[model samples]
Structure formats: structure tokens, C-alpha cells
Target chain A: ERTVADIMVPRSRMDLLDISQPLPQLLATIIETAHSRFPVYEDDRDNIIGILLAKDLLRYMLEPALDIRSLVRPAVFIPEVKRLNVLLREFRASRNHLAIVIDEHGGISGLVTMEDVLEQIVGDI
Target chain B: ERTVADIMVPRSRMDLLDISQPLPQLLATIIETAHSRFPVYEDDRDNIIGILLAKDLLRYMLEPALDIRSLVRPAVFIPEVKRLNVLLREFRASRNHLAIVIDEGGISGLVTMEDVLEQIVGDI
Candidate 1:
């Protein structure tokens, strides 16, 4: 069983945001990345709390004012040593596209997406 | 051995254009269809001469009236009865992305690098 860590996108390659920032700052990152999704940490890497979808934020960026605390969805955390096939099954069942990886110390390690998991078996797009 | 016929985009589904038409007409097909490549036949499907890349047309799409006869490139034609894996190998070896599938009756199908590749990888 290839470990989830084997296919996971290391934290170094990821473009995450410290979620404690204000709406203006969050908006800035959203425009800068133009990515569909982002891993949000509440200051500390290990303190990652949620995933922020670009579409969800764009839906509210037009508003007069918005609080991000109420917008983020819970982030799924999978142990680093989990099998890739097992994680693939869980991802398929849960329909969650992204999950944050946790090391043996329960510390932030990296992230994985459905695309990443699929690529492990099917090769990259 | 899954033959190319098993995964081919049959003639009925291909968006090909007869090359006898004027430049304006060809341009219309290029814009009307968002496809990246098109099979160019001189008049009949059996008379296909080459493939046309969308980017190639875009290069002249903005210019004054151009001569399209000099623009197209020879296309790849493979028998429909070939194995999928073999066809994939041929595609990779030749570095050609699209090939018009041939049958006993001449051109009747289409196969692409994407189509052949996806079968092995599943859909992205």
C-alpha cells in the first residue's frame, strides 16, 4: 500500500493562507492564486481549520461586508500513513475533493486533492 | 487486443470540412466549432488530404484574405482494425495527436491521442 504521504502535495508546494486575515487580505490571495480552492490555517500550520473555495468567496466578495469565519467548511484530516487506495475510497465516498495530511506527530504535513489521488493511478492530466 | 474501431470516433461524429470551399467558409467552420483540429477533405471523405490545427488558422484569422491551400498539413490515417495499444504506440511514436480512422470503405472514423490515452487512464 503506497502511503498517502507518497502522493501528497508537500506543504512547501502548497499556497495556503493564514485564515485570521481580514476580508481584504483574503480577497487579495484569492485573486493572486486564482485557484479553485485553498487550505486555510488560523495562524499556525497545525491549526488548519477549513478549506475555502474560490466560488464561495466570490459569491460574497461583492457584498458590502463579510466575515470569513462563517464561510469556511470543515477540513478533512487524514493520517500520513493512510493507504492511497483507502484514501481514494474515502474521498470517493465522502465526495470531499481536498484533505489535509497529518504526520505521526499529528502536525500539519501537506494536502491532497481528488486530482492528486486519481493521478496516482491514472497518471497526470 | 482492443482494435482502434472499439474506441474510434466514428465518421458520423467527426466535424470535418470539405476543402474545396472558400477561405471565408473554412474560417466560419473554425469559429463555429471550438475543436482544436479538423480533418480536411478535398470534396469526398475518401479525398481527405490533411488535418488543420486551430492555432494555425488563428494565425491568419486576423489578417487580410489569405490563401488556405498552403496552410494545411498531411493527416495520419490508420486502419480501424488495429489494436488500441498498438494505435497508442503509433500515436506516441509519430507524435501525432489525431488520426482519421480508415475502414475498407476509406475514411470512416477518428481517433485522438486524448481518446486513446483516456482509455488507459480513465477519464480525468
Candidate 2:
């Protein structure tokens, strides 16, 4: 019976960025990190606004200079204690591929995604 | 460069069932069809409730009779007009293995899952 804590990658390994950061920097992180998405934070790592995908960043890059904030979508947050199965279902319900795992204090602990979940079952990247 | 509609498997082949259906029946379909998941509908295919995984069904079978409705979760529906890339991204962000493709009227066409496994890399 593996909990989310067992499967989730810790927060330190997660790529984080401030909401005010430029799109170019985010793009670089996506390319360098090889991660399809990242968690957007405000003030600190604890305040995650949304999960941003590499594809979305590409779309943003193609568009003309605009408000970066507008490109960000509403992020779904999950508690650390939640069951992995339930979390996976919630991910499907929301159509969100990424979730920020938060501690009881509302501090971000880690990130989980569809890839992560699939890896648990398929044992492949 | 392709839209979701272009690559989608279309709605005709989808297997849809009501939430009130018996668990044994659902299990039978999974074993018969070999699909890992199925979309749960309320009245018709249009009102999709949530996806039910075969593993979840196995777990449910272990427990005694309870409220079947409680087992159902929210279903994620994507607009038909969405780009495949965007939809794929949404699928990843949500950690959802499956998504119900819905048209303007909320009618489900086909479902997509993580294991459906697209190969953007190379084809032999």
C-alpha cells in the first residue's frame, strides 16, 4: 500500500519559478531540465499558482508580447496525506496532468504528474 | 500540427455504461474487452460521470456492497476544438490516464489514456 509520499518526487528536485519570471527563462528550464511541465510559484515555493507545461510555453513563445500571467492556468493542489489512487482520479476529473503536493502547513512538498503515475504502473519513462 | 479530432479514435467504438450498473457486469466487460478503464455515464453517453479503472473494480469487489455512486469520481471532458498538443499537456498536468472528448453539447466521442501510447519519436 504505497502512499503518495512514497511515489512522489521531492520538492527539491522540482523546477520552480516566480510568476513574474520571463517566458524565455522558463523555456530554458524546460529544455535543460527535460521536464514537460513545472510548478509556478509566488513569494515562495509554498505558493504555487499553477503547473505550466512545456508545450504551453512554446505556444506562449509563438504569441506576441502579452501578459505572462494570463497564460498561467489555475493549479490543483493536493495534500500529502491523500491516497495516490484518489489523487489520480482527481487528476482525471480536473483534466490536469500536474499537481502540487502540499504539507499540512500549505507548503509545497513535491510535484506529481500523469507521467509519474504511469511510471508507477508501467515501470517505464 | 494535428488537432485532437484528427487523431482521435472517434466515438462509435467507445464502451459507455451507467453508474447504477452492477459491479460484476462492469468487471465482466473489462475481462471480455481487456480495456483497463471505462467511462461511467449517468443516463446517456453525454453525461459522463467519471472513469472507472479495472484495478479500482478489483478493489471494489473485495469490499462488501456499499453505495456504488460513492465510487464514482468527476470526469474530465475536453472540448473537441482543442489542439492535440494542448490536450496532451492538459492530460499530463491532470495526471489523468483517460479523458472524455466532448463536443459542444457535452456528448462524449472517444476516450484517451496515458497508456494509449503515442509514438512521436520514431516508427519502425
Candidate 3:
């Protein structure tokens, strides 16, 4: 009976980052926040360009000349109205772990993960 | 020097679906193909609506008239040019297991997951 809408946390609680910032700044944010990942944006929260990981930051830190911006990967975007069950299957098939939620205008809305979807089914985090 | 474009599987090989199909049929295809998940589309492959899981299908089979389409979940769509590392981070942060690859037209393509567990941390 519970749907994705029933359990998904809204966008306000999500931590976001911008791609233009330096690696150290992003790294420090990740460490201080203790979050494994953060959504990266180009201009605004609504304009999320991709997702960034703490581990990837560490990798960039090690390579002095590597452009941190160059290391950012494509972000997975999902519509807010999608069903939870179908999302999980796509997760397994694509081998990705995160998805950004978008509104009708293609603006970033929130985020959802495999764990988020699974929690809906198994009833645990 | 490798980027997401270098490692990501081409879109031509990617398999996608819509949200209107029946549960039994979807489950049968999952069993026959042995794929753990699939992208669910609405009107066309270009109109990807959501994603589905095999485990979810098994659970639905028990609940009669559960409306298989209703059980699907939101899909994760990534642009073709995104970096593999950034995508990986998003995966961990969102706790998502799959991401649908999309072009500028918003059409679904290949998918990516946590298989980098070994490449990054040597874990399976």
C-alpha cells in the first residue's frame, strides 16, 4: 500500500554541492557532514548537474593536477511520480546506486537511492 | 584518462521497458533473461517512466490485482557526459542501485551500478 511518495524525504533535507567549488572545499564538506555523497550543481540547487562522492574527492586530491571537475560523473535523474518497485529493478539493471529527482521542467527536486526504494519493501534502512 | 563515456556500455545494447505491462509477463521475462532489473517506459523506449525489480515482482505475485504498474519506482537518468566517479558518488549518497543513461533528447540508454566495488575498494 505504501508508495514512493509515502516514504521519500523531500529536497529540503538533502545536502547539495556545486561543481565550481575547489576540491578541498568539497572534501571538507564531505568530511564535516559525514555524508558519503552529495549532489553537484552548476548554478543552483534546481540545476543539479551530477552527483559527487567522498571517495572520488579523495582520488582527485591524490592526483594534484587532475581537474576535479573532470572527474564528476553523470547523475541519474528520476521523475518524482515514478513507482518505487520499478525504480529498484532499474537500479539492479543499471548497476547505479543513486538517482536525482526532477520536476516537469527538468529541474532537480530531490534524490532517491536503492536503499530508499528497498526500505519501502523490506521496512528497514 | 578514462571517463564515464569510456567505460559506460553503449546505449544500443541497453534494454528498456514501459510501466503498463503485466506483472506475470514482466516476471517471466526477468526469469527468462535472468536480469535483476529493467527500465520501465510509458509510451516508447524514449519515454522511460520508471524501473522494476525481480524481487518486487515475486512479492507482487502474491498480492492479487496489485496493479504491477503501480508498483514500479522512479528511474535514475544520467547524462551521457557525466564522469564515472561523480555518478558513483551519487549512487552511494542516494543509495540507488541503478542509473539510466540518457542523451540530450532524454531517451533512455545504458545503465550503471555499484560494480565498481572491486575497482575502487576491491570488494565484491
Candidate 4:
């Protein structure tokens, strides 16, 4: 089935944030979207290297250091053709929900999460 | 694997249309759902026979006879296990966007080409 092909937040639509940008601006943008997590990049959106949790920043935010270099967590990359069923298994085992989907050209196709897959089974909460 | 069962809009939330209702009332109901095409049934939501296009109903809105028998088009039905890949092929061949997804219990599911596509490519 095309469960994987049809159920992703495309790269163009992903809420990608450049890690090099000012922390205050990034925090403001994240607050407006009400997103707890984000795919954080270094050079550009294509160089996304880690997942940033908003809660991690709030801890350092009270103090004035915008250091996110140590706060970033690793991100997982998946193929575009990967099955949603199999992906669900991996997510459960790994205890991680977010993943970056890439196509044959190694281009970032989109982002997928446990919530996205779970929505198919349970519908939106 | 779950392209069918899990993707369905479920019985609790299906946007069903009743065919025998008055044109004015039906039009009002249709607008509230924000769906262009709906499963048109005769007696109840379970008796869905054809898909009612909003455009087709609008043409007769001013005419006043409110007869939809001549305007309703056939509907397609598929089981919960009718994998979305197969559905996509059939949808492309048939040139329709909606399908009445039925489970073993009958008429308990709903699937759309848009839903299938949005799941992979992006959200609409």
C-alpha cells in the first residue's frame, strides 16, 4: 500500500529551523506554532542534524545563554519507500517518534512521526 | 498494511447524505459538512446508493423540482482491507475522489483519494 507515500509532511511544508539563527527568534516561532519538537539544522534545511525539544531550551532560556549545541538530540533518517507498519515497530523499539524521510536522491522528502502513523489507526486526537 | 482499516473516516464521523430530504434542507446540511460529494442514501445512511455532487444539486436548486434521481451518480464500495495502493489505481481509472469503505459489519468505513495522497505526499 502507499501508506508511506501518501502520509508525510513534505519537506516544503516541514517546520524546519536553522540552528545558526538567533535563539530568541526561533523560540518565538516555535511558540507561535505550538510545536514541542523541531528538526534543527546547522548549515541549511538540507543539513538538518538534530531534533530540538522546546523544553530543553526553556531550561537554558531563563539564564541568557543561547547554547543549543549540547541540547540537540540525534535525528533518524528513513527511506521514502519504507512501510508504515515496519516504521511503527522501529519507533516503538527505539523510543523515538520523529524521523526524517529521504528519497533515492538522498534529498529530504519529508518528515514522519509516530503520531502521524498512530493517527491512521486511531484518527486525530 | 493498515492503509484501509486505519485510514477510514470511521462510522462515527462519516459525512453521509440522505437523498429523500428537501433540496433546501439537504443543501444546508451539505454546506455544513464542507464536502463536495457525499454518499447519497434513500432511507438511511446505511442504504447509500450513489454519490451526490454539490454542483449537480446546485443546478436544480433554483429549478425547484428538487429531483436528484436523474442527477445522482454511482458509488464505489471497498472493504477495510482494500489496500490504498489498489484503491489509488481504481480511483485513477474511475476518475472519482470518494469511496464508501465497508467493513465485515458493512458500511463502517470511509476512504478518499485525497486522504491516501495526503498521507504520503503531503496534507491538503
Which numbered prediction scores highest in DockQ against the true structure?
A: 1
Q: Pull out the clashing pairs in model 4.
A: A5-B120, A6-B119, A6-B120, A7-B119, A7-B120, A8-B119
What tens-digit string does per-residue lDDT give for candidate 2 at A23-62?
A: 5555555555645556787887767777665444323323
The regions of model 1 sitting more than 4 angstroms off are A61-65, A123-125, B1-124
Which is the leading candidate under TM-score?
A: 1
**In model 4, which runs have C-alpha deviations exceeding 4 angstroms?**
A1-125, B122-124
* lDDT of every model, 2 decimals: 0.72, 0.62, 0.62, 0.71
Q: What is candidate 2's fraction of native contacts?
A: 0.06
Query: DockQ of candidate 2?
Result: 0.04
Residue A54 lDDT, candidate 4, scale 0-100: 57
RMSD of each: 10.6, 18.7, 21.3, 15.0
How many Å off is the CA of A18 in candidate 3? 1.7
CAPRI accuracy category, model 2: incorrect
Give lDDT tens digits, candidate 1, residues A45-102.
6677788765454334234566666667899988999887677668767846789998
lDDT of 3 by residue, A1-125 (tens): 34455555578878888777765565556545635567787877677767765444433323557776765678888887788768767876785677888776766667887766764554331
> What is candidate 4's lDDT per residue for B50-102, written digit by digit as tens?
88765454335234465678778998888888776677668767767688887
Provide TM-scores for the models. Answer: 0.51, 0.47, 0.47, 0.47
Measured as a fraction from 0 to 1, the native contacts recovered by model 3 come to 0.00
- Predicted candidate 3 versus true structure: per-residue lDDT over B18-62, tens digit per residue: 566664455445554535567777777677778875445433323
**DockQ values, each candidate:** 0.08, 0.04, 0.02, 0.02
**Position B35, candidate 4: lDDT:** 53
